[PDB]
Amino acid sequence: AQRPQAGTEKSDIPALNRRMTVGMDEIIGVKKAAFNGKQHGVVMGFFGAAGD
């Protein structure tokens, strides 16, 4: 919905540069494809990894 955009602000007094804030903002949504209660394109697999 919105690409990440940046912006800055002079907070306390713009003449007496005592404070400044930078920031970034985003509108996005991520979801796994699901139809009729089923995974659309993923096969999950569980294996025993010992981690030695």
Binding site: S11, D12, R19, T21
Partner: protein, 140 residues
């Protein structure tokens, strides 16, 4: 041992700006006439998404008797005695300015955004005065 770090466990942390640098709401309800237990009045009104920090209750002398018996309750529409229960600061013998001790750090729900003052016990001899409430809170 399973006492982990809080539901807060990852972020940075607030300072100068438009956040929830803590706030007040103040009202001065004026009682007059005779004072029975059929009294109710809003003094102030609160947000929805806010957590209370502390309530200060200062009143005048409302029952000038040798044995005073006036008694106040401070709360909202859900719980009539949520902040103060049997305050007795309006009596002419005791002292005023009692801070709140019950129900402090809790998120306000919908329909509970108006602070009422209800009279719990009848006044033996009603005088004229006023009651002040200051409620501190903040927002996310």
């Amino acid at each position: 041992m399973p006492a982990t770090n809080s539901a807060q466990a990852r972020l940075a942390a607030p300072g100068h700006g438009f956040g929830g640098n803590v706030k007040v709401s103040y009202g001065s309800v004026a009682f007059t006439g005779t004072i029975t237990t059929a009294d109710a009045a809003t003094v102030c009104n609160l947000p929805v998404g806010a957590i209370v920090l502390g309530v200060t209750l200062e009143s005048d002398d409302l029952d000038t008797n040798a044995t005073p018996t006036i008694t106040l309750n401070v709360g909202d529409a859900g719980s009539a005695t949520r902040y103060f229960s049997a305050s007795t600061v309006a009596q002419a013998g005791t002292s005023s300015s009692a801070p709140a001790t019950t129900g402090l750090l809790w998120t306000v729900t919908e329909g509970n955004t108006a602070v009422r003052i209800a009279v719990a016990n009848n006044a033996a001899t009603s005088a004229d005065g006023s009651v002040r409430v200051a409620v501190t809170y903040y927002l996310p």
